[PDB]
Amino acid sequence: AFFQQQQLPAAMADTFLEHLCLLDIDSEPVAARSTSIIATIGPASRSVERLKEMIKAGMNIARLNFSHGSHEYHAESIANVREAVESFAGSPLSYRPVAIALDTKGPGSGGLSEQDVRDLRFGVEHGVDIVFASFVRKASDVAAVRAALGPEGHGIKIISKIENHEGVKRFDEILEVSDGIMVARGDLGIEIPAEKVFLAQKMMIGRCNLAGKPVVCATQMLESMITKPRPTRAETSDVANAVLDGADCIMLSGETAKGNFPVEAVKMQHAIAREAEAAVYHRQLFEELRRAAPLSRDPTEVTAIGAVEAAFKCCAAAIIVLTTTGRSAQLLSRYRPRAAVIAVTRSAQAARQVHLCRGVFPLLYREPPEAIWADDVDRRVQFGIESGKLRGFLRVGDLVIVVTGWRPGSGYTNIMRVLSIS
Amino acid sequence: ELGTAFFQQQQLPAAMADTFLEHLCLLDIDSEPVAARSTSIIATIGPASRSVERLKEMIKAGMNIARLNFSHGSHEYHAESIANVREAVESFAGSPLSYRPVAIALDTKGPGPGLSEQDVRDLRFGVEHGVDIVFASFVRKASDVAAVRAALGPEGHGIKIISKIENHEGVKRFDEILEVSDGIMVARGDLGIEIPAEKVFLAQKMMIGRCNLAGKPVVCATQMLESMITKPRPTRAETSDVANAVLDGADCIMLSGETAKGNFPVEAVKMQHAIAREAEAAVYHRQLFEELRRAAPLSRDPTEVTAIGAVEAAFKCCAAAIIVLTTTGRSAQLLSRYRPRAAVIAVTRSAQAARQVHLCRGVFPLLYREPPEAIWADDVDRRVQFGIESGKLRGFLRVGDLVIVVTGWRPGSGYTNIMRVLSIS
Amino acid sequence: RADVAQLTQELGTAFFQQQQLPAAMADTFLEHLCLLDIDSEPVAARSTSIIATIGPASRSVERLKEMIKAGMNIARLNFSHGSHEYHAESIANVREAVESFAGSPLSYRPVAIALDTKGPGSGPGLSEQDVRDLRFGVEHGVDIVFASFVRKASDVAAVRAALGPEGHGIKIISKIENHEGVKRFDEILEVSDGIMVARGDLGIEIPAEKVFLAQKMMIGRCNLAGKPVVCATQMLESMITKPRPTRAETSDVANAVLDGADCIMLSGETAKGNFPVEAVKMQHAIAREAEAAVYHRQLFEELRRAAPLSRDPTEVTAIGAVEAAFKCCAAAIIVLTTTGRSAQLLSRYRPRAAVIAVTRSAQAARQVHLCRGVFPLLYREPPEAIWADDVDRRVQFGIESGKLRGFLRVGDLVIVVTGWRPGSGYTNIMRVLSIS
Amino acid sequence: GTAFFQQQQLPAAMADTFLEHLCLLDIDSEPVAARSTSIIATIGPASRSVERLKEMIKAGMNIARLNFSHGSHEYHAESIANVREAVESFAGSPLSYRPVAIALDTKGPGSGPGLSEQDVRDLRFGVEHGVDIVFASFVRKASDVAAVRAALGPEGHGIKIISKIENHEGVKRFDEILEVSDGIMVARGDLGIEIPAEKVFLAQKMMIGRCNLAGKPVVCATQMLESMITKPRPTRAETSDVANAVLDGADCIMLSGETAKGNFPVEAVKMQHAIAREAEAAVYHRQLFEELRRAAPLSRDPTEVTAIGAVEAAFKCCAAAIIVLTTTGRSAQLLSRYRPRAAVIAVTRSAQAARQVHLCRGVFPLLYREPPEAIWADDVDRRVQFGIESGKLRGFLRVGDLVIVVTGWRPGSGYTNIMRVLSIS
Ligand SMILES: O=S(=O)(NCc1ccc(Cc2ccc(O)c(O)c2)cc1)c1ccccc1
Ligand SMILES: O=S(=O)(NCc1ccc(Cc2ccc(O)c(O)c2)cc1)c1ccccc1
Ligand SMILES: O=P(O)(O)OC[C@H]1O[C@](O)(COP(=O)(O)O)[C@@H](O)[C@@H]1O
Ligand SMILES: O=P(O)(O)OC[C@H]1O[C@](O)(COP(=O)(O)O)[C@@H](O)[C@@H]1O
Ligand SMILES: O=P(O)(O)OC[C@H]1O[C@](O)(COP(=O)(O)O)[C@@H](O)[C@@H]1O
Ligand SMILES: O=P(O)(O)OC[C@H]1O[C@](O)(COP(=O)(O)O)[C@@H](O)[C@@H]1O
Ligand SMILES: O=C([O-])C(=O)[O-]
Ligand SMILES: O=C([O-])C(=O)[O-]
Ligand SMILES: O=C([O-])C(=O)[O-]
Ligand SMILES: O=C([O-])C(=O)[O-]
Ligand SMILES: [K+]
Ligand SMILES: [K+]
Ligand SMILES: [K+]
Ligand SMILES: [K+]
Ligand SMILES: [Mg+2]
Ligand SMILES: [Mg+2]
Ligand SMILES: [Mg+2]
Ligand SMILES: [Mg+2]
């Protein structure tokens, strides 16, 4: 029964053609949904009660579109998101962190506009986790956004939106200085021929996967759901193909901001992403990512590849990793393990931000500390196991890979352990 | 010899990549497509696309197959649509650069326990009106195909039966259906109501993969550019869907309400043409050819053996075309199954085979009507030169190019066994 | 170039020109061959063990010390000739030469003692002389038995029974020397600790032109099973009388290593020849060149694809450790082992990094020479009060001994493999450590 | 049949990995194909008798090597006459006649910087006596090859120059030497004294790999069966060395003292024949063909394009043979470079080309002696039928086998462009 589920016959295929031939509509997905969902907050999704339903449906990142609405409007949206998120904090083993992303208005006819400087300052003051920087055309645009965030915004992730020909042509220099990328297909589809957008999307996703940096696919993914309860056949195909392409996140704009079915749009992206993740041909994907990732003398990078290899060898249900900044979890995610990456962190901001990385499930640790550091580490690993059992990731008898470091503080991950559950 | 400009076009840097990941990383929006569009476009005929003048614009835009939906309209209405298609097609007979065959496909209303009475009558209408293809609705098992075949009667055994897979049973019994069918249509409209909407992409990719393995045509259909029924431009999901159906391996892509009743039928055809050309250049031929070769069983059939040798030879020299002489279309179909980048120019005396080979990706039919030469070898050479001169006129070939030529050792269908390398003079 | 660019700037272009590294980075086996370079010098310690047959040319204590220095790892006693008294004196001379280097535990070289049986002769199974010779082996503490003319699984069960309850730790290496042994190979390998491709008799029992097929098949199946395989007989035959071997002989040694042999053997070359020390030096020089020429990119990929999924934590840790070692160009993998098993499971994935096996068992230290790339370090300190401290001291002993021997250098990365509790069978941890 | 797929290591040939290919090698799986690696035997006192030479031709000797380091011109002229007399004693049965090449191995430069005066005289003797090949000793750079070519004069333009790599400089300047040479010899005797003995296998494997990539013949030489100079059977290292030279990709294997002066010249040839047949069946063609195709550059030469198409077609149908008509041997050499499992039966009228194609693995030369037919197409057909009749008599072909036939569009060398699938009747 285990080997009939989650497209495992198609996963064992010797060629990509045979993998396609073995895909089975009756093979049910079992793993938790790996690709994060970004939902744009607006009149249709602003209330606390509506936001609770969207969190339950699968929303991981709330997007604030600063092209419309005042600072007062956006501050109320942020407060409503935080109220809905904290309503589930009473059960720490099941609590789900939700990131808040600020999407800038952009440069308009201008570099960094004066409104963007004020909006970025608002973001830092309100503790946003991510900035989706509009119309990034070159590396100096990213440096300007970074400078506008100041010393208090050092920890905010900058995701550069590629929306025109120049952004595509200067992609490598933009990715180098960015934390990640958004394929902003709306403007991209007007700036370059509509029939070429799929080439830009596939190229950018491939380069972000190679760099190990998050990539978001955005705009018109389930467009018809703004007025209709069910999407078109092209829309479900688009969501599935963005996941198969290698996107870390998928996005909803008008579908959740102003449409009549915001919760249903989130549920639809969740249902498609789960099916598409099981249909990923891991045999070729892992081989290619492993071959292309450069040789490294960084112990976190070395431990990450060893852990992902070990996970595939034993069909590990999960890789439990301790992380301060999210970096150790991101380096595991870049190798696209089938095993869920359960990231145990004390940082509420890192817990929200790791939603940008495919297959990272953040757990915010709030248990009393242990006097002995080695005992504190072990208690965090047991917390990952207990949350994993409650959420359906793990069962007694499963094997897990545990990734830790040799001393406290960020940057010292160097250990991988094989553990039997219970 | 060819220049650096040649190797920058048609996604050639991405084509030379050693891995699929590197192939994706090398895709370039500035690398322009050069080859002729190989995925056929099926447009549904209706009130928005029935007039002779509108049909001429749709042929110019790229329509290769006209679909008649027998779920609506009388026999008289469909006979007038067929006459209008034929009138629009024959209006280009004066210019060899513009004349193109257009297939006519009858899409049945569907089943009741067996073949419905209306389907028996509609299939008989198809034979009487000389249709080329039947898109058989709601095929659930091999006996449904046998019933459609029997209803094509004494005169219509040459009509191609494309089975529409629209429900759970058709998906589960796919192998037995494909075995007795000429091809398959992934009919996503009903399929998306019969099975969970989130599973349709799995059924589409599986059916396309199995048809590619079997060397039989597969059509991707329904809601590909849906928003274009009322809007002049499609959504980002719609252009992505068309490109991904071509990258999946679909031989044909289809338009339904977009051309039958929408406000922009010509624009919908133009959009499918533009996307398909871009997506065909983005196909990773290096892995695709290797996998089709490895999966295809060994064969002692000379047509099959010649086809793989010709496709291998075409890749070796960057051949502009493979010119094949065919009476039934079979030798061209066996070349098409290996997905050459070279266009397959199929020269035939059969008007029906010329229309039907539009079902096979990358087959460009040329209908030959000259009186037959007394010496067979001279008649073969005249048809090969007709393919070369048509290719020159249409932009496929230039003097100095290399072409692969596929013929047989004697007249009649079934004897293809020869592959030649010719320098265009 | 992007996959090695940062490491090339850090370690230098000279590092990536040595040990056939340009040929190692090739995308195809054909390109790997085209890039093999006679100017690319080997750097790694020799990983294929050398078995030398003891005889009149190599029996003295002084001669044995030179053979240990030249690279002999396993001493073979051929029980087809010589009395029990003769073989007991050979064993005592080997042990005296081995213990003459015990003064420095960090450098000392364990040497295994292997008993090669006379065989069944015209009989159907275990002969009476073999029963007596196997009892002599147990009484004299031999580490390995090379069982002659093994034809079926019941032959190895008979050898096992003759070793008695006190010889349970002795490794049984089945010699495949005839058609039946080749045809029943799978059942023989299943119950054996390893195999010897005994080409002398095999080349008379089957057509001489088919021996290479049997050798390549048996080496491939042993590599797939993760069990040691020895290539034997006439590898450097002309060196019995000449100081230099023929072109076919150097080729044969290199190809046995490239095929995947864990051990290579010398018979008359060391037992009776005029150049026993030179024959050992020649096998050492060829094996180091051939080990660097192994196409690890395809070999590692194929060993992972063919090896079934495992729920054994030692097996899971071993593949993770070998993958980590390749990622950082690790100098060594340091492993703690009681029986040798954790080191054997690392060895089956054929890492380029040396596997430094730290053990308290003198017998396991001798026996791990059967596994390619395992360098045994015998730890003699009494146990620390706290088990975690005792584990740490053994890891540090491997590091310090490694540095003092040129295996490790300051700045190198090392992979360390340990377990969660004392006793054999609990290896489950892999650590990345920087050498300071 | 199942018996067919159990022979010639076919279970090991179908393996998905090289490791699984090794695990499936079977000592009971008998070789079926004809031996494709040529055997060069050095002529000396043990192999000069016309009667002894007839036995060596029957045992499998394809090339007779004359070592000009020993013996006078008078001695070598008698060797040549004895070889020719033994070879021509079988000319009375044209369907079984085996051509045998004559190769002149030069003394070398000695302590000098380039072409010695004795080599100039020996090379002139070679041209005057019609030798087919020159094995040029101690080639260190491209100018050494040009000097050998100049010494052959205007009448020796058709002689093949095989450069012997015997020292460090030859290995380091390998690429420039291969570029101007017809092929290479890995001369392990001197190479093993000029560089450390333990590094010779690296130079051998590298040079064989680069020659396979370039599509040029490579010879493995010296001490392959050394102990057979005095003993009836070789050592285990010697049989392994022969098998590994074939597995490495050598086109030819050589015997020196084993045939020139030893007591078992015929047995040494029989032993190389037996080992080479076993080793050729153990070649992992799945990976080898894939890598040769991937590495071989794109080509606009029709002979090269036809060759890859023909080899691909041969693998698809398990063709018993590829029958090629050739004037210079070039069309057969281009087929050989893709290492088909099918035997390349090369039909030629050139006695010299028939002798020289023995340098290319898997090429079986057939010398055609009939004068040209009046109709060129009939002359082509008669030569193809001669290849079939020779193949049937020699055991290469049987009724029911498929063969690939490679011809050109006009008489004269350089116009091969046709591949055809033929059933043996
Ligand atoms: O491992 S992957 O999932 N590769 C998917 C993939 C797609 C197309 C083809 C080429 C082909 C196209 C269509 C075919 O039907 C067919 O047989 C072959 C081969 C492989 C992967 C994904 C993302 C990044 C790296 C790697
Ligand atoms: O297709 S071939 O015959 N390749 C042979 C080959 C040998 C070793 C390995 C590396 C390895 C892998 C697995 C092993 O078991 C093992 O002993 C060594 C991989 C491939 C071929 C020959 C020549 C040129 C191109 C191609
Ligand atoms: O992923 P990051 O940010 O590098 O954090 C990993 C760090 O987490 C740990 O596992 C635990 O550290 P803390 O006890 O400081 O939380 C460290 O050993 C390791 O360096
Ligand atoms: O593709 P099909 O229908 O098998 O037809 C291929 C046939 O066409 C030819 O090339 C030409 O045949 P005709 O002269 O009869 O048209 C034959 O030699 C070959 O058998
Ligand atoms: O390779 P083996 O024989 O399984 O030994 C590995 C064992 O060695 C250890 O690392 C140390 O164990 P000891 O303290 O008993 O020597 C164990 O944790 C582990 O189980
Ligand atoms: O291999 P080569 O030397 O190019 O010879 C191939 C030539 O042989 C032929 O098949 C037959 O030519 P001939 O009739 O002159 O012998 C030509 O058509 C072709 O060009
Ligand atoms: O800004 C965006 O999100 C877009 O243009 O798609
Ligand atoms: O009939 C169709 O085309 C469908 O249901 O998609
Ligand atoms: O016994 C042996 O070692 C042999 O036969 O090779
Ligand atoms: O000259 C030769 O043949 C050699 O040195 O091997
Ligand atoms: K915005
Ligand atoms: K219909
Ligand atoms: K013995
Ligand atoms: K000479
Ligand atoms: Mg935008
Ligand atoms: Mg329908
Ligand atoms: Mg023996
Ligand atoms: Mg020499």
mmCIF file of C-alpha atoms in Angstrom, chain A residues 136-246:
data_model
loop_
_atom_site.group_PDB
_atom_site.id
_atom_site.type_symbol
_atom_site.label_atom_id
_atom_site.label_comp_id
_atom_site.label_asym_id
_atom_site.label_seq_id
_atom_site.Cartn_x
_atom_site.Cartn_y
_atom_site.Cartn_z
ATOM 1 C CA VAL A 136 13.773 45.379 -10.210
ATOM 2 C CA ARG A 137 15.901 46.136 -13.295
ATOM 3 C CA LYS A 138 19.490 45.836 -11.934
ATOM 4 C CA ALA A 139 21.590 45.108 -8.791
ATOM 5 C CA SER A 140 21.601 48.814 -7.738
ATOM 6 C CA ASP A 141 17.771 48.697 -7.409
ATOM 7 C CA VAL A 142 18.175 45.963 -4.743
ATOM 8 C CA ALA A 143 20.909 47.970 -2.943
ATOM 9 C CA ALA A 144 18.533 50.984 -2.845
ATOM 10 C CA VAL A 145 15.750 48.844 -1.282
ATOM 11 C CA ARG A 146 18.249 47.423 1.242
ATOM 12 C CA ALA A 147 19.471 50.942 2.199
ATOM 13 C CA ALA A 148 15.849 52.152 2.644
ATOM 14 C CA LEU A 149 15.210 49.308 5.130
ATOM 15 C CA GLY A 150 18.081 50.631 7.338
ATOM 16 C CA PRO A 151 19.909 48.924 10.215
ATOM 17 C CA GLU A 152 16.593 47.911 11.860
ATOM 18 C CA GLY A 153 15.533 46.083 8.631
ATOM 19 C CA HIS A 154 18.740 44.004 8.177
ATOM 20 C CA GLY A 155 16.763 40.766 8.720
ATOM 21 C CA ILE A 156 14.003 41.450 6.154
ATOM 22 C CA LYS A 157 14.159 39.214 3.033
ATOM 23 C CA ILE A 158 14.228 41.028 -0.321
ATOM 24 C CA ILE A 159 12.460 39.149 -3.136
ATOM 25 C CA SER A 160 13.090 40.937 -6.445
ATOM 26 C CA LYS A 161 10.136 41.060 -8.859
ATOM 27 C CA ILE A 162 11.232 40.543 -12.503
ATOM 28 C CA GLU A 163 8.629 42.371 -14.604
ATOM 29 C CA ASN A 164 10.343 43.555 -17.807
ATOM 30 C CA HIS A 165 12.963 42.780 -20.496
ATOM 31 C CA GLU A 166 15.811 44.464 -18.572
ATOM 32 C CA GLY A 167 15.089 42.457 -15.408
ATOM 33 C CA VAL A 168 15.250 39.220 -17.452
ATOM 34 C CA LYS A 169 18.503 40.207 -19.207
ATOM 35 C CA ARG A 170 20.181 41.352 -15.978
ATOM 36 C CA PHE A 171 18.731 38.372 -13.993
ATOM 37 C CA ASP A 172 22.086 36.948 -12.828
ATOM 38 C CA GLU A 173 23.261 40.213 -11.220
ATOM 39 C CA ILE A 174 19.833 40.717 -9.574
ATOM 40 C CA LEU A 175 19.655 37.163 -8.142
ATOM 41 C CA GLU A 176 23.226 37.472 -6.775
ATOM 42 C CA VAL A 177 22.234 40.369 -4.454
ATOM 43 C CA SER A 178 18.606 39.301 -3.761
ATOM 44 C CA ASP A 179 17.277 36.779 -1.231
ATOM 45 C CA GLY A 180 14.946 35.411 -3.970
ATOM 46 C CA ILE A 181 12.881 36.211 -7.069
ATOM 47 C CA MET A 182 9.252 36.651 -8.084
ATOM 48 C CA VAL A 183 8.254 35.918 -11.710
ATOM 49 C CA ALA A 184 5.723 38.800 -11.881
ATOM 50 C CA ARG A 185 3.855 37.579 -14.967
ATOM 51 C CA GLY A 186 1.256 40.391 -15.133
ATOM 52 C CA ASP A 187 3.634 43.193 -16.099
ATOM 53 C CA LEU A 188 6.102 40.721 -17.683
ATOM 54 C CA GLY A 189 3.345 39.605 -20.113
ATOM 55 C CA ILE A 190 2.828 43.240 -21.259
ATOM 56 C CA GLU A 191 6.584 44.201 -21.286
ATOM 57 C CA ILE A 192 7.630 41.193 -23.415
ATOM 58 C CA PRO A 193 5.503 39.141 -25.933
ATOM 59 C CA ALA A 194 2.857 37.093 -24.029
ATOM 60 C CA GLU A 195 4.008 33.909 -25.820
ATOM 61 C CA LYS A 196 7.550 34.278 -24.321
ATOM 62 C CA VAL A 197 6.572 34.533 -20.599
ATOM 63 C CA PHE A 198 6.750 30.721 -20.097
ATOM 64 C CA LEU A 199 10.424 30.775 -21.268
ATOM 65 C CA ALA A 200 11.292 33.541 -18.751
ATOM 66 C CA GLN A 201 9.388 31.684 -15.987
ATOM 67 C CA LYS A 202 11.110 28.328 -16.633
ATOM 68 C CA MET A 203 14.570 29.935 -16.978
ATOM 69 C CA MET A 204 14.215 31.994 -13.756
ATOM 70 C CA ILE A 205 12.872 29.038 -11.767
ATOM 71 C CA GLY A 206 15.738 26.839 -13.049
ATOM 72 C CA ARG A 207 18.392 29.449 -12.142
ATOM 73 C CA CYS A 208 16.890 30.018 -8.671
ATOM 74 C CA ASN A 209 16.805 26.233 -8.078
ATOM 75 C CA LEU A 210 20.499 26.066 -9.127
ATOM 76 C CA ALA A 211 21.372 29.003 -6.808
ATOM 77 C CA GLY A 212 19.357 27.519 -3.903
ATOM 78 C CA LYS A 213 17.275 30.719 -3.587
ATOM 79 C CA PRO A 214 13.461 30.953 -3.312
ATOM 80 C CA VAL A 215 11.403 31.637 -6.441
ATOM 81 C CA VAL A 216 7.735 32.675 -6.532
ATOM 82 C CA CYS A 217 5.382 32.140 -9.477
ATOM 83 C CA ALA A 218 2.734 34.891 -9.572
ATOM 84 C CA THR A 219 -0.354 36.409 -11.327
ATOM 85 C CA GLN A 220 -3.507 35.019 -12.977
ATOM 86 C CA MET A 221 -2.854 31.450 -11.756
ATOM 87 C CA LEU A 222 -6.568 30.976 -10.865
ATOM 88 C CA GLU A 223 -7.923 34.256 -12.404
ATOM 89 C CA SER A 224 -11.449 32.988 -13.278
ATOM 90 C CA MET A 225 -11.975 32.179 -9.555
ATOM 91 C CA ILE A 226 -12.421 35.954 -8.926
ATOM 92 C CA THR A 227 -16.086 35.408 -10.063
ATOM 93 C CA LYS A 228 -16.455 31.591 -10.497
ATOM 94 C CA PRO A 229 -16.352 28.862 -7.790
ATOM 95 C CA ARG A 230 -14.219 26.502 -9.927
ATOM 96 C CA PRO A 231 -11.164 27.326 -12.077
ATOM 97 C CA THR A 232 -10.611 26.593 -15.783
ATOM 98 C CA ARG A 233 -8.587 23.579 -17.069
ATOM 99 C CA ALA A 234 -5.741 25.986 -18.076
ATOM 100 C CA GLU A 235 -5.610 27.420 -14.530
ATOM 101 C CA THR A 236 -5.232 24.071 -12.720
ATOM 102 C CA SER A 237 -2.601 23.109 -15.318
ATOM 103 C CA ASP A 238 -0.717 26.419 -14.692
ATOM 104 C CA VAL A 239 -0.560 25.845 -10.914
ATOM 105 C CA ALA A 240 0.598 22.220 -11.358
ATOM 106 C CA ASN A 241 3.228 23.222 -13.948
ATOM 107 C CA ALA A 242 4.622 26.039 -11.723
ATOM 108 C CA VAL A 243 5.208 23.398 -8.989
ATOM 109 C CA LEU A 244 6.678 20.902 -11.536
ATOM 110 C CA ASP A 245 8.922 23.733 -12.899
ATOM 111 C CA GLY A 246 10.409 24.057 -9.363
#
